[model samples]
Target: MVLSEGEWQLVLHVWAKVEADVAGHGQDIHIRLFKSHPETLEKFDRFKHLKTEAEMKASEDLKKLGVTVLTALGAILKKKGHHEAELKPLAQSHATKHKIPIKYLEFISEAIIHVLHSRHPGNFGADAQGAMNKALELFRKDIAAKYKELGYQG
Candidate 1:
């Protein structure tokens, strides 16, 4: 679904507040995800042996992954969600190289919502999350299709 100008406008507003502390906000995303889904840790080599919640969510490498994910979302937003082409390489790498299941990406979506809601409660409202859902839904489709195209059975 496409975002209405209302939803888009709202999203842009809060993301602007988030822009100032991108990495830290981004880091919290996985912290939320890890708290929700511990399996996500063993999926990444950088996250391996990070069984303890203390180390898993606090490690330095996880911070960079947060930056990477935020950068991709920022790119999607920059294009106003017309991001299919740009997202292909990301899909390909995660599918072929990372070997992560497509379902795991869903957790990232929830984590983003949690972070945005907590950090910008005033601006991150229903409409902003609606736009976010619309935007990341496009991301989900793009990457999922890429995985299928590359012969990923799932």
Candidate 2:
């Protein structure tokens, strides 16, 4: 289910819109994530204790976290077909080091789609959604496979 050339192009069209302000949108991603699925909050030890919206938004550590995630996605998009290699260290860390569960790993991409659709409803239609979904499925699965290889339940 690799993204075709045109599919990558379609994905990037919407990605470009967020690329400019990814740092600012990171918390927005988490807000939606926690709002829709509070269970994930337990996984975020850095801000799990943040019960209020204002408290969640003001964390510099969390904001920098968003930037890292969004920027990493951007880097993978740039690598495209080479993302398996690009994601090696990341997948390894998540599997052996970070200890994040696979289900929660999928949530951030959902949050990204939600944020993107909110910002660019006109551009992020079903077709673009398909492309982004395909791309992220690959991303998620690669990380997940590493857990299996390393004998982690996630």
Candidate 3:
């Protein structure tokens, strides 16, 4: 997906804030994802038992995972369509090891937009939302395609 320069600038502005508070922002995104889509939490047995946001926030493992995911998001956003080289291995692990269905990835794509908007309501504008949606959509698409190509039955 191609982003306008204006759109890229918008996303960069948003990313700077997210990068500055990765742990806080990452937890917020995952917390919102689990709350809005409870079923998404079931895939991770380690975190499935976490009923409250506080529990998730306090989890060192979850915190590390969140930072990893958000950092990947920043990478994808930085390169946009040119991120396949980085995304391929991640898609393989998620599909093969984690058994993450494409649907959950879809949910994550939307969840990102939701989290960004919720955390920085004033900074995350309509154009930034659209940019993020398209960036993640491309990311998911590349990942899913790679997942299928890896010949995983799941």
Candidate 4:
């Protein structure tokens, strides 16, 4: 699953487009997540009271937060391996403070893949999807292993 330079470039190209629409793209990802996995919304204090996607979409602050999270994920994708410097802190916060499970992270990965595909239409082809999938798998493995080391099994 080691991404070649070309594969990384393919991912980065699509991601650059995503970064251009950071707010809209990130919010859409979370909205899709909430719709697809409603229980995960409880982990976010900002979304706890919101019962509908429309309500969630109306929150500018939350949307910015989503952008920030997506940006961090993008940073992680810029590298490869079991432990990039950015990976541990992300895993720690989500595993400890947020108490997010690996399954929820998987849901986030799926949401991201869907967002990339939907936003870009034909641009995000098989190669792009494979790159994204590999990058996500690295992220998940890092988070899971670190979570275990931190005495959390998520």
In each prediction, how many residue pairs overlap at the backbone (N, C-alpha, C within less than 3 A)? 0, 0, 0, 0
Flag regions of model 1 displaced more than 4 Å. none
lDDT, ranked from best to worst: 4, 2, 3, 1
For candidate 2, write residues 1-154 as lDDT tens digits: 5789989998888888888788777779988898888998887777889887788888888889889988888999877768767777887777677778988878878988898889889889999999989888987877777678777858
- Which regions of candidate 3 fall more than 4 Å away from where they truly are? none
lDDT of 4 by residue, 1-154 (tens): 4667787788778888888888899899999999999998899887688888889899988798998998888777766453467877887788789999899999989999998898896769998898778878877877888899888876
- As for model 2, its CA RMSD to the true structure in angstroms is 1.4
Candidate 1 — what's its lDDT?
0.78
Q: On TM-score, who's better, 1 or 3?
A: 3
Off by over 4 Å in 2: none
Which residue pairs collide in model 1, if any?
Answer: none
- Between 1 and 2, whose TM-score is larger? 2
> What's model 2's TM-score?
0.92
Best by TM-score: 4
Residue runs of model 4 more than 4 Å from their true location after superposition: none
Model 4: lowest-lDDT 10 consecutive positions: 75-84
lDDT of 2: 0.83
TM-score of each: 0.89, 0.92, 0.90, 0.93
